Amino acid sequence: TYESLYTKYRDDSAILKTEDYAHWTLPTVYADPDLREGKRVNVRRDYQSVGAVYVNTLSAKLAQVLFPANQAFFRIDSTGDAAQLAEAMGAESADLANGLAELENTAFRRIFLKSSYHQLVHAMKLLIITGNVLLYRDSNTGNMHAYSIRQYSVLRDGGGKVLDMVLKERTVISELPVEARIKYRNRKQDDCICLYTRIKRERRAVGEVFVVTQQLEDGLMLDNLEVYPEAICPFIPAVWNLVTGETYGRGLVEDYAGDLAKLSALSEALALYEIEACRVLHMAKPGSQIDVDSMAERESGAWVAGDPNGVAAYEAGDYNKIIALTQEIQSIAARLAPAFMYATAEEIRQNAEEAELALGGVYSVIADTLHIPLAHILCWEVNQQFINELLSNGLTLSVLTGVAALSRSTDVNKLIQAAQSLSVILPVFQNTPRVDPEKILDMVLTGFGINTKDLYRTEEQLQALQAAQ
Amino acid sequence: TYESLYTKYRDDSAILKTEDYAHWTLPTVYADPDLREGKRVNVRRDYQSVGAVYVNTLSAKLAQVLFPANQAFFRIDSTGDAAQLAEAMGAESADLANGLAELENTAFRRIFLKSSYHQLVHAMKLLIITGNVLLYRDSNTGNMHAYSIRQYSVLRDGGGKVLDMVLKERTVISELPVEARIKYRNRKQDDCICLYTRIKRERRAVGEVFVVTQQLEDGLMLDNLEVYPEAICPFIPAVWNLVTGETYGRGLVEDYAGDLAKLSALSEALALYEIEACRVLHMAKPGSQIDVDSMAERESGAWVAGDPNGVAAYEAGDYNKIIALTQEIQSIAARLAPAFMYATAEEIRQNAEEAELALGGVYSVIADTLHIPLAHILCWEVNQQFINELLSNGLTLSVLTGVAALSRSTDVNKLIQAAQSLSVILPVFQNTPRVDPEKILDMVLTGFGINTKDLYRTEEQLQALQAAQ
């Protein structure tokens, strides 16, 4: 009876309010799937297209910053406890730094298989306009899909923890498993049948757990029970702005509804004036001597008798109004521009920082709510054994995010500077025997923020080098 | 009776609505083939030509970005499972990297044989204007063809999976096989006869399958049964924008119909004024002393008696209206410009990124829906055995797309930078024996994102080099 839960957990007020926001920017992203059965039903548009362009540009731009195509978007600290991390893979105490880097480098490419990038862009659009999205990642094939709030509903506490979810989907009988298709032997046409999925949180001895099950419209279960640890669950609900106490988030467009509402009416008035500007009439002045028939029926080049100014073109003075309205609309549009950001790894650094400045602190929220689970899922896909050992014991991987994934990104810059300075300081002091070069080295290296333990040689290596002479 | 299915699967509303979009941009691309039998039937044009220029420019530009002429448009990851991939070709563990690169480099040239590029451009036009296209690739010869929704119809579930298709085509009796031409012995003229093809999805033990069959108008089958795995099917339906629940997609032009509709009327009014500006009349003022006969019939150079201002040229004041209308039309046209993008491998990178920014996230959709099957088809054409082994077992090739085919494109840039930095850091630290050069190497290389396993020498090679002394 998952239909009962699905209906119970909905919020009609938010669904009804979020129609205008879509109507002002991109109506086709928020279309109701329950009013159509495979045929077009018309969708109306608005008198202005500024919102569409702004939203398209911002959604396209956000994808490049969050998911760069030539470097990983997450880093592993590993400073917590190297013992267990090294014991899981079975490597030396120092080879962990190389192994983690190899895993991170080889893992992030998996996000570009089987059209995931397009779904990511669609999810960004959904988050910007409606502020809610559910993301499903299939490990067997490598494909993803994004859903709107018209196909799912969630339940959470006052503290924000998600407790339950239900998802609706439509299909046909031919797609069902052989076990369940023995029933419904009649009516084996391409008739549509609904399917429901439920995700529920539960706790076992070694931690919390998510349980997945499925059911048809008429109560019948379909087995397929699966259990995942909370860290590697394939379902990811996300929010843009979440007011404490509520269940669903809010979008960026909701903060700027007044300007769009004030712009649509001006656009309508401009359209009315432009349509009025298409009257082509010629007026014959009354009280003037003219020969209308000859003027209107003679071939070009003839001579006629009458005043050379007895006929004039219709004039209403509506051009100045168009000129005036255009300037006001342009001024409002320009004033709205900054809010929507309309205009080597360091380039990505600066772009992300400027996105932080423009958005106001949501880039960090998006990074926090998306980067953490995807990293675990991809790492599990690339190496099952290593993650299985970590989850069974209870401890979990540490990941850095929030414009802070520069752990292995821009350390070479801090080494180049040290090398440049060491080439200027050491040539001097070579003659003076009172200054120890080792202390200068140990001061300069630590000054720039480099852990000397990853560069200095061990005692055994020095002894071997001295012996090899 | 494939005619019944063909008629059943059509959507008349979309077909009737999509006429205006073609009429505003390029009427000849959407002409009905069932109203003509080999003779011209006139096609009407519109008062404005902005849409035609914009569509031509965008369609021409899109082809260069998607299908560059001097590098492959797809890359193979191979990180999934090198065991089976190496076992299929019969190569070593490390020679796979070279073999895959060779295959990718030698495969992509096949797209330029026998006039495929023109069909690709036509398909891009069709996608932009109507948002639907069916693409057929013939392996025997190397030619392609593109069809509009006036010649085919498709069926899909609520989830978007395509289940069935039907295609219509016209020909003559002389083209039929000898087996079927024994019938229809009479009427062996060049009379036109229709032909129908059906593509249906079905599942067998080792995966899903597509079945192709043909039939004439009068029920008679023509044999030619063929079976393809779903991955290497030669038919590819595509969409530009697909609203969940519906069957056919939507085009880019549909988002900007209001501006074009508002522009056509202004163009008509401008044409009316321009036609009015062709009245050449001379008016003889009433109440003035003049000698009209002498003025109008004497040779040039004569002297006449009369006022020097008794005759004036006709004046209606319609020039200012032309000046005004031109500015408004130009302003609207300029405002429409950005939406249609009107204005070394890195150049292609930047061009594709800017296309991503302008379009709003469709470049990725087009790449996802076109690159994946064409890669498999071309690879099968260049090497049948390798693909046959992979498909029989069940596993499939992994391909990267969505402005993410840079796997083997721009790795040399990340190596040049490392080489430049290594030439500045290693000259220093040569005197200090406390810093190990190997650790600096292993840090700098991994910092830029290079898998050291493809550069470092193995233990055996080092031993051999040491012995060779």
Residue numbers in the entry:
A (entry chain B), B (entry chain A): 7 to 349, 359 to 484
Which passages does the manuscript contain on this structure?
Podophages that infect gram-negative bacteria, such as Pectobacterium pathogen ΦM1, encode tail assemblies too short to extend across the complex gram-negative cell wall. To overcome this, podophages encode a large protein complex (ejectosome) packaged inside the viral capsid and correspondingly ejected during infection to form a transient channel that spans the periplasmic space. Here, we report a near-complete atomic model of the bacteriophage ΦM1.
An adaptor assembly (gp52) interfaces with the portal and six tail fibers (trimeric gp47), each of which appears composed of long helical bundles much like phage T7, as well as adapts trimers of spike protein (gp39) which may be homologous to those in phage P22, another podophage, and 9NA, a siphovirus. The EP3 octamer adapts the locally 8-fold symmetric interface of the ejectosome to the 12-fold symmetric crown of the portal by intercalating the EP3 helix α-2 between the crown domains of adjacent portal monomers, forming contacts with the C-terminal portal helix. EP3 intercalates in a pattern in which two EP3 α-2 helices intercalate in the gaps between two adjacent portals, followed by an unoccupied gap. This results in four unoccupied portal crown domain gaps, and eight filled with the α-2 helices of the EP3 octamer. The C12 portal complex that sits in the locally C5 MCP environment results in a symmetrically incompatible interface that is best characterized by C1 symmetry. In our 3D classifications, we also identified two populations of particles in which ejectosome structures were aligned, but portal density was also rotated by ∼6° about the Z axis. This suggests that the ΦM1 portal may also exist as two discrete particle populations. Reconstruction of capsid dimers to low resolution reveals a probable interface forming between opposite and opposed adaptor proteins. Inspection of the dimer interface between symmetrized adaptor models auto-fit into the map suggested that this oligomerization likely forms due to formation of a putative reciprocal salt bridge network, forming between residues Arg25 and Asp23 of each chain of gp52. This hypothesis is tentative given the poor map resolution.
